[PDB]
Symmetry: C3
Subunit: 146 residues, 3 copies
Amino acid sequence: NMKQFCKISVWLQQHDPDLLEIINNLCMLGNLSAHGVTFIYPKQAKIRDEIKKHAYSNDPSQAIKTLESLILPFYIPTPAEFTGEIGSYTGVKLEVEKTEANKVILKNGEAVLVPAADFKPFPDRRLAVWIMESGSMPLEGPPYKR
Amino acid sequence: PSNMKQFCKISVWLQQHDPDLLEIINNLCMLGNLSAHGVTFIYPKQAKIRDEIKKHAYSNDPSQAIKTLESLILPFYIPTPAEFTGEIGSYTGVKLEVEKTEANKVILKNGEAVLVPAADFKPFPDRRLAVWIMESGSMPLEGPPYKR
Amino acid sequence: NMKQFCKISVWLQQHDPDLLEIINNLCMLGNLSAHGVTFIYPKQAKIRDEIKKHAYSNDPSQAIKTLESLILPFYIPTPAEFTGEIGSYTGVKLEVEKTEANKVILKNGEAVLVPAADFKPFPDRRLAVWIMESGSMPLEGPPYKR
């Protein structure tokens, strides 16, 4: 069990090996590899099992877009960086509803995001992991200029 | 565990059906041959073909297992019996000659390879991947090469 | 078991899966892949004990630097090639104290290196594995210049 992380997959392996297995079996591990990378871990098991349900269905389309909505190609370590033209691999721009010192609430789903207390990246490696305690990440909306 | 119904790469299908064979392909540094010109994989159903792959791989000279696995991987997208035509072949370079064609079966010369499309291999719509089941015979190893 | 190897990782997967997992968890698997590559497996347990301890600590800096000293970006199959401007990923130049037909003893730690009896590379692959029966690989010193 690692305490520092050179890649997000090592963190996800210690928390949810099943979800990491789905990311690999969907050919999406490259989206998790660092432009920075910020992963949104859905804490609620109902969300993750809905991902597993769709991923192991005859059409994993919804599991793909949902996992795309949880992976941002940007390095966002603190609430201060949750600003500007940023978003997930779906392309939908994220809009902040409320900001705090260690918490962020987004619009278009009301997703409450708190930085992972145990995730800490290697020196100068631009990786970040947030915990989605409630709500859902946006799926459709205005795009961010990439 | 992994129970994908659609496949973004052939290794996912192999991991669920034959994980030991996938480990052999990885241990022989041949996973790149399986990845996307489009790729068609021929899965060996019979024991004596698969056992010789395992034995040759874990022997002092794994070259024979490498050549056999090269015969089972075609750098072409061949989903149906109709596509088994023209200058196509495996990584051995040998051109495939069709003996008899059916709606859902192909028999090849130079080994009597009886090939049936794997029904449970359904690739992603944007992936030029195909998996066939060799029910008997052997894929061509040596023969006239196909024009590159 | 494999008798011939296309990459060092397959050999380490058979002899020490724990050490391979550490290398992957430190994002150092690429250091072992081929210019040639020479891996030095520490036979003594406590050297591998300390690698694991520093790896899963709060700061894996030492486990990283230790593994860097065990991986050489050069193809050294026999004692005859243990000469010239050679060294590990730490950059420190290796100086040979004693050379034999099937053994090589280094300065700056008295590392006794014998080629692995069961590692035979693929014909066109420049990979070699040595067993460090005693001593330590150099950590600091004058660098060879690439």
